[PDB]
Design a binder for these strands. Structure first.
Ligand SMILES: [Zn+2]
Lengths: 119, 49, 50, 52, 85, 101, 71, 14
RNA sequence: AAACUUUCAACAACGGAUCUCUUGGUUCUCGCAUCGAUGAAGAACGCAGCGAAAUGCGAUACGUAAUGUGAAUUGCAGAAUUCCGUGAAUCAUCGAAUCUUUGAACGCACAUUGCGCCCCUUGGUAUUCCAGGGGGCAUGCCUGUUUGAGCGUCAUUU
RNA sequence: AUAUUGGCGAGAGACCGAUAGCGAACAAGUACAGUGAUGGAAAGAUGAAAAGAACUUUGAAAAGAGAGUGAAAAAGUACGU
RNA sequence: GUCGAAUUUGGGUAUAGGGGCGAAAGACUAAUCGAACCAUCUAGUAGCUGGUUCCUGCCGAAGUUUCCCUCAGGAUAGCAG
RNA sequence: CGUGGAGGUCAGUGACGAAGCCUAGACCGUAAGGUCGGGUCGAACGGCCUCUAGUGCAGAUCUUGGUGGUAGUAGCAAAUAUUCAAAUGAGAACUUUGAAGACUGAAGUGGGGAAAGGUUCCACGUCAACAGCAGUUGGACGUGGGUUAGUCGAUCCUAAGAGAUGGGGAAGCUCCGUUUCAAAGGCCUGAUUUUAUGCAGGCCACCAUCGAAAGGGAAUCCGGUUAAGAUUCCGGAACCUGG
RNA sequence: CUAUCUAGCGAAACCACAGCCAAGGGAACGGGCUUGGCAGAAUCAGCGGGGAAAGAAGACCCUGUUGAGCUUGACUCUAGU
């Protein structure tokens, strides 16, 4: 069965810490039994739940750091995007849509007109 | 090498020509693509000719 | 050798754990074609070359 | 495939070994070693006049 | 003398393992792998060695990051997450 | 043909010198101020054998005139030079054996 | 190993290969509430780490090993 | 692989 | 005359041809543009209740979360509340995470699981020693700041 | 507009049909060789379904003879023909 | 044969292919040396050798001319279809 | 004449048995080859008009695979040498024990290690393959256990030598060189008591790093203990370093 | 100690088919052909006459408009100087 994440996301941080150490104690108490018994598949669920709890904690802290660095340039290299080396190095649409005044005037005066040819 | 009465031929296949042989199997698919591109350009410039 | 590096010892340990026959329940699985372990190594027959 | 039959480093052994002079596969430990190579009459071989 | 007896004197390894290729091709006296070129920055490759390139190039391993690049591209390198439709 | 033995002696692979037991380069003292305006005194502390050299060496000790230090020079010994002997190096030095006029 | 823990007051554990004697000592003190006298580590030939942990005379490894739940 | 040495005879050959 | 030899047939063998199959290849065409210091490709070691591999993954280890579908997985065992439901599944999807030791590999090194330095903190009666925990310390180049050096050099000093 | 034995995704063939076709239809760039660079395989098909032969007997056992499953054991994992 | 030294030897280390090393034998350089090994150019060229896959029917030779660094071959005329 | 495939026809044959294979059984054809019957077998296949080609084998010291005669033959003969009984077992020239006879003969067939190997160590079970006969045994097979260090070593130092940096060459992969034509760094005491560490002084100039399980080197010994570990574990008795 | 016989184990070289001679002719020295002599299962141990026995596409010689090593007032160049 295991624990669910939707019911952990409501909990605080300290509750999760206690949940976590309880679960690791339980996993120890299971790995002392696995050597006596041949089979013990319950252990997978506890491993699974530990992983879920850690994922939740990681997300809770990463979101706090996002809101901390909200509204400013220079946020960290694991919170902002990843997309690709090239696309990160490429011109923004600002930096690419930049024109000279010489060409803006010509674009406003003489743009491609919408013509049609029957009569 | 030279033999009976036949014209002196000048066939330029003493290089590695069989690395550069372009057979145009592409012809029909490419015509299709040309037609579709023309139609696309038309739709983009929808009134224009 | 006896006075050996950890890396060598580690690679040996891996070889040891690998020196096993099949688990005989894999043969019973559906669409199974594995009859035996064909990567099986023995110290007399074939050397690791590490 | 143009590569077909030619993905080997085979060399004839010559004369004095009591074998045909077809190119043969070098090395050891395999079964393929010593086997004929590159030829139409040979297994793993190149077909005669490969289709273009 | 040059055969069977002289092969008994062979107990010193000219090559050991490399930390970039794991192949037992690292020469101890020259400090150079004969497969990977380590510790050169450029992985050793030659185009006369086609089978060799074929044995080490991309795909021959896991592609721990690059498997997913086609998928991220297909979905447009998006961020955020779904919305429980 | 083949590269001959005299041609192979320039790479310096096995034809280099065997220089481990040699005590050092038997150089005279650097020409500073004393040796061109006066003299400076040193003392011979030991005569020793140098491997690959049929002439013995003399470990002459001079003083550094600028720092409290005891820079030691390695001279080729001359016939008659002995331990406890004072060597005088410079322009205004006497014409005796061992001196560096 | 069960002969060791009855007689010599020596617990035998499987340990992370990144761990050392300091960590093992601290961790036995934490998880089992016992004072450790010495630690002796070997790397087994299956690649795992084995720790022999000898406790003080105040405690008895036989009495805490069944508290853990193995004997 | 083998180059046996006994087939080598130059006595009476030349 | 039997045995033996040889020939042919039946049945039995040896062997694995032929025949029929084919989640594979090969070629042709179409379409797209997407690796990496935000740490790539590749390598090593490891992870499953019972796996040596392949495949997958990284001490959250044949996987986590999220979304979707909607009751499986399967070789055995086991679990069942998960079955008119925030929910099975070696499911698909994947936008959030983890991502050992390495590698362009980045503290110095490496035939070593070696040797250091800085910050914050904890314990040991401790700025200095020891240990643990977290975070850091490459090169080259660019822009800028700060601190500087040079009778290179100007002015102003009394 | 042109190129494109690579990569991602698709569609097709008067192509090959397991000594062929890619080296690789399979745990294949594997096993194995080699100091090393490098070299480099073999290996497909039971049957619709394991229903993969309970049980009896001879034998130390493997196995045999019987019986039995199955449309067929002239299909018994040394398995289509 | 020699056996206290121009000795024997381990390990580390250097010397890498027209290069090394050589008390010099063209000796050794991983069973490879009058120029190692690996892969590629490379299916290298060959007037030279060997081989060249079904039936029947009709016709049916030449080993000679001239030329060629030509003489184990080709062009040419001739014989044949 | 035959083969692989393609367009067409025969509304062609076929699980009531396609193709294939065997057949000193039949029929046709000069022949290539075709056809029928029987047996086996199990899923597809053919005649005619045309198209197409990776299209027909006795040879190539052909390729790959498989099999023979040779032939139950050569042969399993170096290292002095075995024998008796019992037990085990289905079974004993070879296993185990015992008794005897022998050898290595301390420049050993002993006891330990270096390299290399890598779990071969040890136990239990066990004999299809391996042990060129055998096998109840084994370095085999299967399942498991097992290697404990402040003092032994690596780690540290330099050797021959290797090799970044600065710089210089080179189209370039990279080469030279290792203190060089470099502005190449860090150590004691403190001084303050916003206070943590700046300024106060002063000192110092080497100028990376790698390179030895046989060189150099801080320090441990006895007794006991395991199936298998020990200068490492237990007991006792010591020592070095750092603080 | 082998060989030898036995129990167990168990290869290889080589092989067109095979294995009695004389002469004849014949690719000028035949196991086969012609003419003659002859000719009776299956075989063991030895032997070394023959099988122009096996081992290797002669290493001597010649040919190749194939090479390489070496030399030199060959032909043509060249690092260096
Ligand atoms: Zn490497």
């Amino acid at each position: 069965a295991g624990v669910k994440a939707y019911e952990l996301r409501t909990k605080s941080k300290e509750q999760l810490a206690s949940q976590l150490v309880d679960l690791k104690k339980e996993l120890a108490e299971l790995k002392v039994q696995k050597l006596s018994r041949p089979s013990l598949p319950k252990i997978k669920t506890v491993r699974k739940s530990i992983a879920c709890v850690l994922t939740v904690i990681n997300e809770q802290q990463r979101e706090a750091v996002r809101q901390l660095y909200k509204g400013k340039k220079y946020q960290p290299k694991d919170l902002r995007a990843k997309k690709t080396r090239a696309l990160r190095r490429a011109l923004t649409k600002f930096e690419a849509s930049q024109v000279t005044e010489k060409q803006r005037k010509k674009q406003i005066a003489f743009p491609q007109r919408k013509y049609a040819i029957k009569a | 090498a030279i033999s009976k009465n036949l014209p002196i031929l000048k066939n330029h296949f003493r290089k590695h020509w069989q690395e550069r042989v372009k057979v145009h199997f592409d012809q029909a698919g490419k015509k299709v693509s040309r037609r579709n591109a023309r139609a696309t350009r038309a739709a983009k410039i929808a009134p224009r000719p | 050798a006896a006075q050996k590096s950890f890396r060598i010892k580690q690679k040996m340990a891996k070889a040891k754990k690998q020196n096993r026959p099949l688990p005989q329940w894999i043969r019973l699985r559906t669409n199974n074609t594995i009859r035996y372990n064909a990567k099986r190594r023995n110290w007399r027959r074939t050397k690791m070359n590490i | 495939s143009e590569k077909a039959g030619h993905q080997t480093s085979a060399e004839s052994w010559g004369t004095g070994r009591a074998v045909a002079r077809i190119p043969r596969v070098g090395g050891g430990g395999t079964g393929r070693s010593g086997q004929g190579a590159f030829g139409n009459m040979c297994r793993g071989g190149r077909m005669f006049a490969p289709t273009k | 003398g040059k055969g069977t007896p002289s092969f008994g004197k062979r107990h010193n390894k000219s090559h050991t393992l490399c930390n970039r290729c794991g192949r037992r091709s690292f020469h101890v006296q020259k400090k150079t792998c004969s497969s990977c070129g380590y510790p050169a920055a450029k992985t050793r490759s030659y185009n006369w060695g086609a089978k060799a390139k074929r044995r080490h190039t991309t795909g021959t391993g896991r592609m721990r990051y690059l498997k997913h690049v086609s998928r991220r591209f297909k979905n447009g390198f998006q961020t955020g997450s779904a919305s429980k439709a | 043909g083949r590269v001959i033995r005299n041609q192979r002696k320039g790479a310096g692979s096995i034809f280099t010198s065997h220089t481990r037991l040699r005590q050092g380069a038997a150089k005279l003292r650097t020409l500073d101020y004393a040796e061109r305006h006066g003299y400076i005194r040193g003392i011979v502390k030991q005569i020793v054998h140098d491997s690959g050299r049929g002439a013995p060496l003399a470990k002459v000790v001079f003083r550094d005139p600028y720092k409290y230090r005891l820079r030691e020079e390695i001279f080729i010994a001359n016939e008659g030079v002995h331990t406890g002997q004072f060597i005088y190096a410079g322009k205004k030095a006497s014409l005796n054996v061992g001196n560096v006029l | 190993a069960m002969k060791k823990v009855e007689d010599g007051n020596i617990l035998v554990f499987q340990v992370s290969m990144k761990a050392n004697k300091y960590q093992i000592k601290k961790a036995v003190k934490e998880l089992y509430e016992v004072d450790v006298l010495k630690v002796n580590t070997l790397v087994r030939p299956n690649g795992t780490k084995k720790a022999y942990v000898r406790l003080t005379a105040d405690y008895d490894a036989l009495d805490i090993a069944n508290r853990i739940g193995y004997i | 692989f083998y180059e046996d040495y006994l087939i080598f005879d130059c006595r009476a050959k030349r």
